[PDB]
Amino acid sequence: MNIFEMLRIDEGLRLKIYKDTEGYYTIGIGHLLTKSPSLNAAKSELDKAIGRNCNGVITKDEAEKLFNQDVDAAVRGILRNAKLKPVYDSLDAVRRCALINMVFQMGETGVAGFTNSLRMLQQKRWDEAAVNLAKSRWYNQTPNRAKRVITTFRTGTWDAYKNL
């Protein structure tokens, strides 16, 4: 398993504009288009992102290209972030994937806000961090996905996804 397969499982693949769990306009493999309520504003962002008039619809190839950009940007963001980098550097390969997943879903800023959990992961207190991560809006809003990520940090294996 790898970061791409992991995220593909958590986000799904949709070739037409859709609303995410939060009601925001998205497309592909979890690529947020806009937090704006206008489908028009969304269609505009989409064409800008793809470089063509899509009319709200993209191809598999276009979806995967946006996905490659997003994963790269998530990684680069962690590496540039003063709060995230040290955590990332301290982790094993599997756990690194779990932090990338959080950043992809919620943004650098959002994850950087999980101060206490970050501290526990850095210290390698697995069970404690898992319990702390679950006390969040994130967990209450998307519990199945959060549990998968949480188990990953807890165990350092891909068990939560070898089901899926």
Side-chain angles (χ1 to χ4, degrees), residues 114-152:
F114 285 56
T115 302
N116 309 315
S117 298
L118 293 184
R119 213 192 60 250
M120 287 171 225
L121 288 163
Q122 225 200 297
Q123 290 164 64
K124 308 198 179 283
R125 298 174 175 228
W126 321 122
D127 283 61
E128 301 93 314
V131 162
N132 189 262
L133 280 160
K135 302 179 159 139
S136 52
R137 179 190 189 266
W138 169 64
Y139 182 82
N140 286 104
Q141 283 327 108
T142 49
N144 291 155
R145 167 177 196 161
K147 270 167 212 166
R148 281 195 292 277
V149 178
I150 288 165
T151 289
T152 305

Short mmCIF file of all heavy atoms in Angstrom, two decimals, residues 114-152:
data_model
loop_
_atom_site.label_atom_id
_atom_site.label_comp_id
_atom_site.label_asym_id
_atom_site.label_seq_id
_atom_site.Cartn_x
_atom_site.Cartn_y
_atom_site.Cartn_z
N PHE A 114 -3.36 20.81 15.84
CA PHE A 114 -3.45 19.66 16.75
C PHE A 114 -2.19 19.54 17.61
O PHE A 114 -1.55 18.50 17.71
CB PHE A 114 -3.64 18.36 15.93
CG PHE A 114 -5.01 18.13 15.33
CD1 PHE A 114 -5.63 19.05 14.49
CD2 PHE A 114 -5.71 16.96 15.63
CE1 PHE A 114 -6.89 18.81 13.95
CE2 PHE A 114 -6.99 16.71 15.13
CZ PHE A 114 -7.57 17.64 14.28
N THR A 115 -1.86 20.61 18.28
CA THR A 115 -0.68 20.75 19.11
C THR A 115 -0.34 19.58 20.01
O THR A 115 0.77 19.09 20.00
CB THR A 115 -0.84 22.01 20.01
OG1 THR A 115 -1.01 23.14 19.20
CG2 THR A 115 0.42 22.16 20.81
N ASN A 116 -1.30 19.19 20.86
CA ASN A 116 -1.03 18.12 21.80
C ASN A 116 -0.77 16.76 21.15
O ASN A 116 0.09 15.97 21.57
CB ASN A 116 -2.10 18.09 22.97
CG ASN A 116 -2.31 19.47 23.66
OD1 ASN A 116 -1.33 20.17 23.98
ND2 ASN A 116 -3.57 19.92 23.85
N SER A 117 -1.60 16.44 20.15
CA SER A 117 -1.46 15.16 19.43
C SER A 117 -0.11 15.09 18.74
O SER A 117 0.48 14.05 18.70
CB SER A 117 -2.45 15.01 18.30
OG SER A 117 -3.76 15.03 18.80
N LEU A 118 0.32 16.20 18.13
CA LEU A 118 1.60 16.28 17.41
C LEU A 118 2.76 15.95 18.36
O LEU A 118 3.71 15.20 18.03
CB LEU A 118 1.81 17.65 16.69
CG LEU A 118 0.84 17.93 15.51
CD1 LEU A 118 1.18 19.24 14.81
CD2 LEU A 118 0.92 16.84 14.47
N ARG A 119 2.66 16.51 19.54
CA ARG A 119 3.67 16.35 20.63
C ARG A 119 3.77 14.88 21.05
O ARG A 119 4.84 14.28 21.18
CB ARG A 119 3.21 17.18 21.81
CG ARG A 119 4.28 17.80 22.65
CD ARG A 119 3.72 18.35 23.95
NE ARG A 119 3.08 17.34 24.80
CZ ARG A 119 1.76 17.26 25.02
NH1 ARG A 119 0.90 18.12 24.48
NH2 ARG A 119 1.28 16.29 25.80
N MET A 120 2.59 14.25 21.22
CA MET A 120 2.54 12.84 21.56
C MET A 120 3.08 11.95 20.43
O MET A 120 3.75 10.94 20.62
CB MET A 120 1.08 12.40 21.88
CG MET A 120 0.65 12.94 23.22
SD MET A 120 -1.10 12.64 23.47
CE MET A 120 -1.64 14.23 24.12
N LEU A 121 2.76 12.29 19.18
CA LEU A 121 3.27 11.44 18.11
C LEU A 121 4.80 11.57 18.10
O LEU A 121 5.54 10.61 17.90
CB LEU A 121 2.71 11.86 16.72
CG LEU A 121 1.21 11.51 16.51
CD1 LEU A 121 0.72 12.33 15.33
CD2 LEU A 121 0.97 10.02 16.21
N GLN A 122 5.30 12.80 18.29
CA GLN A 122 6.74 12.98 18.25
C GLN A 122 7.42 12.15 19.33
O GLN A 122 8.52 11.65 19.18
CB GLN A 122 7.11 14.47 18.47
CG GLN A 122 8.18 14.86 17.44
CD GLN A 122 8.98 16.08 17.78
OE1 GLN A 122 8.41 17.19 17.86
NE2 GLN A 122 10.30 15.87 17.85
N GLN A 123 6.73 12.01 20.45
CA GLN A 123 7.26 11.28 21.56
C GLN A 123 7.05 9.83 21.42
O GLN A 123 7.50 9.12 22.31
CB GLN A 123 6.65 11.70 22.90
CG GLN A 123 7.10 13.11 23.36
CD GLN A 123 6.22 13.71 24.46
OE1 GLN A 123 6.15 13.21 25.58
NE2 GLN A 123 5.54 14.81 24.14
N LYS A 124 6.32 9.41 20.35
CA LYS A 124 6.03 8.01 20.09
C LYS A 124 5.13 7.36 21.14
O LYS A 124 5.26 6.15 21.44
CB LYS A 124 7.27 7.16 19.81
CG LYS A 124 8.11 7.79 18.70
CD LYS A 124 9.11 6.82 18.08
CE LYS A 124 9.93 7.46 16.94
NZ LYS A 124 9.18 7.56 15.72
N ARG A 125 4.20 8.16 21.69
CA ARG A 125 3.20 7.64 22.65
C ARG A 125 1.90 7.36 21.85
O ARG A 125 0.92 8.16 21.84
CB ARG A 125 2.97 8.68 23.71
CG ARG A 125 4.24 8.92 24.43
CD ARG A 125 4.00 10.04 25.38
NE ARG A 125 5.15 10.26 26.19
CZ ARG A 125 5.03 10.39 27.49
NH1 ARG A 125 3.81 10.32 28.06
NH2 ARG A 125 6.13 10.59 28.22
N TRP A 126 1.95 6.22 21.14
CA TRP A 126 0.92 5.80 20.21
C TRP A 126 -0.50 5.77 20.69
O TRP A 126 -1.38 6.37 20.08
CB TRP A 126 1.29 4.61 19.32
CG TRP A 126 2.72 4.61 18.82
CD1 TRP A 126 3.64 3.62 19.04
CD2 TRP A 126 3.38 5.62 18.05
NE1 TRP A 126 4.82 3.95 18.43
CE2 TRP A 126 4.70 5.16 17.81
CE3 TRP A 126 2.96 6.83 17.48
CZ2 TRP A 126 5.60 5.88 17.00
CZ3 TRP A 126 3.89 7.58 16.72
CH2 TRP A 126 5.21 7.10 16.50
N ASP A 127 -0.71 5.08 21.78
CA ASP A 127 -2.02 4.96 22.36
C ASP A 127 -2.54 6.28 22.86
O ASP A 127 -3.70 6.63 22.66
CB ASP A 127 -2.03 3.85 23.45
CG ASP A 127 -2.07 2.45 22.78
OD1 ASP A 127 -1.21 2.02 22.04
OD2 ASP A 127 -3.17 1.78 22.98
N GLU A 128 -1.66 7.09 23.45
CA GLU A 128 -2.13 8.35 23.92
C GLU A 128 -2.51 9.26 22.81
O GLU A 128 -3.48 10.02 22.92
CB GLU A 128 -1.06 9.03 24.77
CG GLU A 128 -0.68 8.16 25.99
CD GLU A 128 0.51 7.23 25.80
OE1 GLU A 128 0.74 6.47 24.81
OE2 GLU A 128 1.25 7.28 26.89
N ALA A 129 -1.69 9.25 21.74
CA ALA A 129 -2.01 10.14 20.65
C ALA A 129 -3.37 9.78 19.99
O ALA A 129 -4.14 10.66 19.59
CB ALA A 129 -0.91 10.12 19.61
N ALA A 130 -3.63 8.48 19.85
CA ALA A 130 -4.88 7.98 19.23
C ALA A 130 -6.11 8.47 19.98
O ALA A 130 -7.07 8.92 19.41
CB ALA A 130 -4.90 6.45 19.11
N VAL A 131 -6.06 8.39 21.30
CA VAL A 131 -7.13 8.86 22.13
C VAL A 131 -7.31 10.36 21.97
O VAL A 131 -8.43 10.83 21.84
CB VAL A 131 -6.90 8.47 23.60
CG1 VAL A 131 -7.77 9.30 24.50
CG2 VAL A 131 -7.25 7.01 23.77
N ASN A 132 -6.21 11.14 21.97
CA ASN A 132 -6.28 12.62 21.82
C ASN A 132 -6.80 13.04 20.42
O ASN A 132 -7.53 14.03 20.25
CB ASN A 132 -4.87 13.27 22.02
CG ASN A 132 -4.95 14.79 22.08
OD1 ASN A 132 -4.72 15.55 21.11
ND2 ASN A 132 -5.38 15.27 23.22
N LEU A 133 -6.38 12.31 19.38
CA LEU A 133 -6.82 12.71 18.04
C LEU A 133 -8.35 12.58 17.89
O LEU A 133 -8.96 13.28 17.06
CB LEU A 133 -6.15 11.78 16.98
CG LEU A 133 -4.70 12.11 16.60
CD1 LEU A 133 -3.94 10.93 15.95
CD2 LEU A 133 -4.69 13.33 15.72
N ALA A 134 -8.94 11.61 18.62
CA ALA A 134 -10.38 11.30 18.52
C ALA A 134 -11.24 12.37 19.15
O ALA A 134 -12.45 12.44 18.89
CB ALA A 134 -10.68 9.88 19.03
N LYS A 135 -10.62 13.25 19.95
CA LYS A 135 -11.35 14.36 20.59
C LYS A 135 -11.28 15.58 19.71
O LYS A 135 -10.61 16.58 20.04
CB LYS A 135 -10.73 14.75 21.91
CG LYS A 135 -10.70 13.58 22.82
CD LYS A 135 -10.06 13.96 24.12
CE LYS A 135 -10.45 12.99 25.21
NZ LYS A 135 -9.32 12.64 26.08
N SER A 136 -11.91 15.51 18.55
CA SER A 136 -11.83 16.59 17.59
C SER A 136 -13.11 16.62 16.75
O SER A 136 -13.79 15.59 16.57
CB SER A 136 -10.66 16.29 16.61
OG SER A 136 -10.83 14.92 16.05
N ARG A 137 -13.39 17.77 16.17
CA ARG A 137 -14.51 17.87 15.26
C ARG A 137 -14.31 16.88 14.09
O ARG A 137 -15.23 16.18 13.63
CB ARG A 137 -14.56 19.29 14.67
CG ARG A 137 -15.71 19.43 13.67
CD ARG A 137 -15.71 20.72 12.85
NE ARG A 137 -16.95 20.89 12.06
CZ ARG A 137 -17.05 20.50 10.80
NH1 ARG A 137 -16.01 19.94 10.17
NH2 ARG A 137 -18.22 20.67 10.17
N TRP A 138 -13.04 16.78 13.61
CA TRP A 138 -12.61 15.89 12.50
C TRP A 138 -13.17 14.45 12.67
O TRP A 138 -13.77 13.86 11.78
CB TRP A 138 -11.05 15.83 12.46
CG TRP A 138 -10.46 14.76 11.56
CD1 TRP A 138 -10.60 14.70 10.20
CD2 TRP A 138 -9.51 13.74 11.95
NE1 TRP A 138 -9.87 13.63 9.71
CE2 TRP A 138 -9.15 13.03 10.77
CE3 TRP A 138 -8.94 13.39 13.17
CZ2 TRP A 138 -8.22 11.96 10.78
CZ3 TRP A 138 -8.02 12.34 13.18
CH2 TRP A 138 -7.71 11.61 11.99
N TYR A 139 -12.93 13.90 13.90
CA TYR A 139 -13.34 12.56 14.26
C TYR A 139 -14.87 12.47 14.28
O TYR A 139 -15.49 11.53 13.76
CB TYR A 139 -12.81 12.26 15.66
CG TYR A 139 -13.18 10.86 16.03
CD1 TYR A 139 -12.40 9.79 15.58
CD2 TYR A 139 -14.29 10.60 16.83
CE1 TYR A 139 -12.71 8.48 15.92
CE2 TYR A 139 -14.61 9.29 17.17
CZ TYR A 139 -13.83 8.23 16.72
OH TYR A 139 -14.12 6.94 17.05
N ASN A 140 -15.51 13.44 14.93
CA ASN A 140 -17.00 13.43 14.99
C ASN A 140 -17.70 13.59 13.62
O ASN A 140 -18.75 13.03 13.36
CB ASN A 140 -17.46 14.52 15.97
CG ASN A 140 -17.17 14.04 17.36
OD1 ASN A 140 -16.22 14.48 18.01
ND2 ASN A 140 -17.91 13.03 17.74
N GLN A 141 -17.11 14.35 12.71
CA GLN A 141 -17.66 14.60 11.44
C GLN A 141 -17.44 13.47 10.42
O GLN A 141 -18.32 13.18 9.58
CB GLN A 141 -17.14 15.94 10.85
CG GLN A 141 -17.75 17.26 11.43
CD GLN A 141 -19.22 17.24 11.88
OE1 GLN A 141 -19.59 17.28 13.12
NE2 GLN A 141 -20.06 17.20 10.87
N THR A 142 -16.23 12.85 10.40
CA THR A 142 -15.93 11.77 9.44
C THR A 142 -15.30 10.66 10.22
O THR A 142 -14.12 10.39 10.05
CB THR A 142 -14.99 12.23 8.28
OG1 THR A 142 -13.85 12.91 8.80
CG2 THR A 142 -15.68 13.26 7.41
N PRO A 143 -16.06 10.03 11.12
CA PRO A 143 -15.52 8.99 12.00
C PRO A 143 -14.89 7.74 11.33
O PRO A 143 -13.87 7.25 11.80
CB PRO A 143 -16.66 8.58 12.93
CG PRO A 143 -17.95 9.05 12.22
CD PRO A 143 -17.56 10.03 11.11
N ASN A 144 -15.45 7.20 10.24
CA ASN A 144 -14.87 6.02 9.63
C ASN A 144 -13.47 6.29 9.04
O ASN A 144 -12.55 5.50 9.22
CB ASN A 144 -15.78 5.42 8.56
CG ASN A 144 -17.06 4.78 9.20
OD1 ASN A 144 -18.10 4.66 8.56
ND2 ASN A 144 -17.00 4.37 10.46
N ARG A 145 -13.35 7.40 8.34
CA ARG A 145 -12.08 7.81 7.78
C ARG A 145 -11.09 8.17 8.94
O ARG A 145 -9.90 7.75 8.94
CB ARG A 145 -12.16 9.01 6.84
CG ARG A 145 -10.75 9.54 6.58
CD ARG A 145 -10.79 10.65 5.62
NE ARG A 145 -9.52 11.01 5.02
CZ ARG A 145 -9.55 11.72 3.90
NH1 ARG A 145 -10.73 12.07 3.37
NH2 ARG A 145 -8.41 12.09 3.30
N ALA A 146 -11.54 8.98 9.93
CA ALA A 146 -10.67 9.33 11.03
C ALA A 146 -10.15 8.04 11.73
O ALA A 146 -8.99 7.89 12.07
CB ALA A 146 -11.33 10.29 12.02
N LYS A 147 -11.03 7.08 11.97
CA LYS A 147 -10.63 5.84 12.63
C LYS A 147 -9.55 5.11 11.86
O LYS A 147 -8.67 4.51 12.47
CB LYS A 147 -11.79 4.88 12.74
CG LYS A 147 -12.56 5.08 14.00
CD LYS A 147 -13.87 4.35 13.95
CE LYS A 147 -14.93 5.09 14.73
NZ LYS A 147 -16.28 4.59 14.42
N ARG A 148 -9.68 5.08 10.54
CA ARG A 148 -8.68 4.43 9.71
C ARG A 148 -7.32 5.10 9.90
O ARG A 148 -6.27 4.44 10.08
CB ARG A 148 -9.06 4.43 8.21
CG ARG A 148 -10.10 3.35 7.82
CD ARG A 148 -10.17 3.15 6.33
NE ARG A 148 -10.70 4.29 5.63
CZ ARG A 148 -12.00 4.58 5.45
NH1 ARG A 148 -12.98 3.84 5.97
NH2 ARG A 148 -12.35 5.64 4.80
N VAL A 149 -7.32 6.44 9.85
CA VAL A 149 -6.06 7.22 10.00
C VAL A 149 -5.45 7.03 11.41
O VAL A 149 -4.24 6.81 11.62
CB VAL A 149 -6.30 8.69 9.66
CG1 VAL A 149 -5.02 9.51 9.87
CG2 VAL A 149 -6.77 8.77 8.21
N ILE A 150 -6.35 7.10 12.38
CA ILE A 150 -5.98 6.91 13.76
C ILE A 150 -5.34 5.54 14.01
O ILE A 150 -4.32 5.42 14.68
CB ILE A 150 -7.12 7.20 14.74
CG1 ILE A 150 -7.38 8.72 14.82
CG2 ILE A 150 -6.68 6.70 16.13
CD1 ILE A 150 -8.72 9.09 15.49
N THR A 151 -5.93 4.49 13.46
CA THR A 151 -5.38 3.13 13.62
C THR A 151 -4.02 3.02 13.03
O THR A 151 -3.18 2.31 13.55
CB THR A 151 -6.30 2.11 12.94
OG1 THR A 151 -7.45 2.07 13.76
CG2 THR A 151 -5.65 0.72 12.91
N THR A 152 -3.82 3.72 11.91
CA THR A 152 -2.55 3.78 11.21
C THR A 152 -1.46 4.39 12.11
O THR A 152 -0.34 3.86 12.25
CB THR A 152 -2.70 4.48 9.84
OG1 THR A 152 -3.73 3.83 9.07
CG2 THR A 152 -1.40 4.36 9.03
#
